[model samples]
Target: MRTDLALDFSVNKENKTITIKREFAAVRAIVWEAFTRAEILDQWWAPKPWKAKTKSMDFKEGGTWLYAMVGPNGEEHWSICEYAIIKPIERFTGKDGFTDASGKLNTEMPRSNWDMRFIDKGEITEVQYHISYDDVAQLEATIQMGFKEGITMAMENLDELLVSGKKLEHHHHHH
Candidate 1:
């Protein structure tokens, strides 16, 4: 079995926020691409045994990515991430919400804003994920939906992708 690296997770119930901090044994650009590109994201965005498939992605400021997480039993959960800001190799911010198969946002479900930061540490990258919900109840509901374990598993999957030396060239063409 592959072991996961140390990851720190914290919840501020009063503030309706969730935070996750992890260190990856990869360069910051490479790590950032994993989060920004659909091709790279599909390789590691879902927890083990589950898989992520992006139906469409426009990776620009104010763009959106609509994807599905398919379970082992073939169940699918759709979600959309609307990008608010995109700073290359450093940070990005987006609003996340549950959606339908047609990529329609589900107003019945809670929504959250995700602010992700990537810090370069030479050979390592420190990633910080800050999520803010509309209210404490929404935050609580998200946590109840196994958010912690799911994110941890996804992070580990990203680590595995980096370790496997997969080439993520989504950003390289511009350079």
Candidate 2:
């Protein structure tokens, strides 16, 4: 069972942060898995017309997820998400940055810290995402780089995955 829920998104330049709040009809475990598992994440991490592929991922604290987003023209943009905190279905925190295919961080692009929380609401799940940058300048630069549009589209893609029953698809890859 699935139902539509409002998606709240806001960017605060003064605080160098972005906040995203959304609810899904799926249970917290299911929603959390979609976010924590690289296989499920790759299925919806990129916006439509673009696709994501993971090179390797270690989802534990102090681990990293190295992935690439392929554009419609086949150009690849790589990123690495280094996990700082992991609390199973309750929450996770990480720092994400543009990176080379080898997982080397790119200093030119802004890196951001993410704190994600999943709350159980019986049959529904509430997700709260907070992203922080080093400074307001970095935050503004990311906004100029289409961070809002890209993430909004990605979240919508996740919703579609849940609704279409793809979020529960089983995979043997170890997280």
Candidate 3:
């Protein structure tokens, strides 16, 4: 995690949900693009030292966002998300799960539904995420896997990427 990026996440047992908040140095447009656009998403979605390799993405209702995150040992872990709703810079709701490149749900892997909200904070963008599991056991298992920490790392990565992206864009224009 970058020293400048602050990551925060919490688990709400009562609601069976996990919330993660991150402050990106870029504006809402850049943050939203980093999430919605496949090219941008592929750059920083996973928590490194694990990187993402996006296979395909269709950002729309009933569309699937599919990708695989490769481990340092050369093993591939596939993940996909089904978009339920999309409202540009405001909100996005999706069912995220392990899946094949063809968008077929892989039942062997656990599933999680995610709702992400983007809040503009003048020059920054605040990204708030809620991830809900299917049941108590699922939630427990996921929590046990240290999901909160993984999400914290991921959010901090987003902030770093956004900040660097904004700076690079600025340099390109100013130079």
The 0-to-1 C-alpha lDDT of every candidate, in the order given, reads 0.70, 0.71, 0.69
> In terms of lDDT, which candidate is stronger, 1 or 3?
1
lDDT of 2: 0.71
Please provide, for model 1 over 125-146, each residue's C-alpha lDDT reduced to its tens digit, 9 standing for 90 to 100: 7878887767566567657666
**Of models 2 and 3, which has the larger TM-score?**
2
Worst 10 residues of 1 by lDDT: 166-175
Expressed as tens digits, the lDDT of each residue in 1-175 for candidate 3 is 6532456678888887788776656677766666667767655556444667778777668888777777777566677778887766777677878665455666666787788788887876777888887678756875766565556665566567756775564334443
Where does candidate 3 stray beyond 4 Å?
A: 1-5, 48-51, 100-104, 108-110, 135-160, 169-175
User: Which has the better lDDT: candidate 2, or candidate 3?
Assistant: 2
Worst 10 residues of 2 by lDDT: 42-51
Clashing pairs in 2: none
Order of models, best lDDT first: 2, 1, 3
Error of 1 at 41 (Å): 2.2
